[PDB]
């Protein structure tokens, strides 16, 4: 059970990496794990729940990637690591945004904490840039700038006709963030 639970998370991560989030099937994972398909449902409520565990690991990788007198430079460096991550782990990266997870519904504490912890890396330099801003103001700015970088990265990496060209993604993130708070 302890071994099986871990083995299923390992295999789920492997599948997402190979063929994407949409390719994950209970029959196939059970076959790879050498268990009954119902053994998957003994450890996770559904495939979405198993995907959240994979996303837990993806957050950990992102947190390692992200990690003081130049706060705009810190924001840029972190954004460049986000871009590099998205490029390096495209399918795991897309699973973070494609899994069923909403601010409306129940967010599990471990999951909500991991995401809150990533956001604190962005809020630190923003507090230096905006010394007069309160926590609500800082939280809103963190969400705005993160959402902005994600948009640049999403449209650019998808090669959409509206996005910034691939070769200019790093440069354009810099140019956007340099302007933040003068």
Ligand X SMILES: CCCCCCCCCCCCCCCCCC(=O)O
What CA–CA distance (Å, rounded) separates 170 from 87? 12
Please, what is the minimum distance in Å from the beta carbon of residue 61 to ligand X? 10
Please, what is the minimum distance in Å from the beta carbon of residue 177 to ligand X? 6
User: Among 41-49, 51-59, 92-100, 158-166, which window interacts with Cl ion (CB under 5 A)?
Assistant: 92-100
Q: Is 148 in the site for a copy of itself (CB under 8 A)?
A: yes
Q: Which does 125 bind (CB under 5 to 8 A by kind): ligand X, Cl ion, a copy of itself, none?
A: none
Among residues 9, 96, 152, 164, the one that binds ligand X under rule CB under 6 A: 96
Long-range Cβ contacts of 16-21 (<8 Å, 24+ apart): 16/51, 16/54, 16/91, 16/92, 16/95, 17/89, 17/91, 17/92, 18/91, 19/91, 20/91, 20/94, 20/95, 21/51, 21/91, 21/94, 21/95, 21/98, 21/99
Interface residues with a copy of itself (CB under 8 A)? 97, 101-104, 107, 111-112, 115, 119, 140-141, 143-152, 154-156, 158-165, 168, 171-172, 175-176, 178-182
């Amino acid at each position: 059970k302890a071994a099986l639970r871990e083995k299923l998370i390992d295999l789920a991560e492997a599948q997402i990496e190979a063929e994407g989030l949409a390719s994950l099937r209970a029959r196939e994972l059970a076959r790879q794990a050498d268990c009954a398909v119902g053994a998957i449902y003994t450890h996770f409520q559904d495939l979405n729940a198993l995907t959240l565990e994979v996303n837990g690991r993806t957050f950990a990788r992102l947190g390692a990637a992200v990690g003081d007198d130049h706060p705009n430079e810190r924001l840029i460096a972190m954004s460049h690591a986000y871009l590099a991550f998205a490029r390096e782990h495209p399918k795991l990266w897309r699973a973070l945004f494609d899994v069923e997870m909403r601010s409306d519904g129940p967010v599990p504490q471990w999951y909500g904490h991991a995401m809150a912890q990533l956001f604190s890396y962005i809020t630190t330099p923003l507090a230096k840039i905006f010394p007069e801003s309160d926590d609500a103001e800082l939280d809103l700015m963190t969400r705005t700038l993160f959402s902005s970088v994600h948009g640049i990265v999403l449209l650019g990496l998808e090669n959409r006709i509206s996005g910034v060209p691939g070769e200019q993604l790093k440069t354009m993130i810099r140019l956007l963030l340099e302007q933040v708070g003068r």
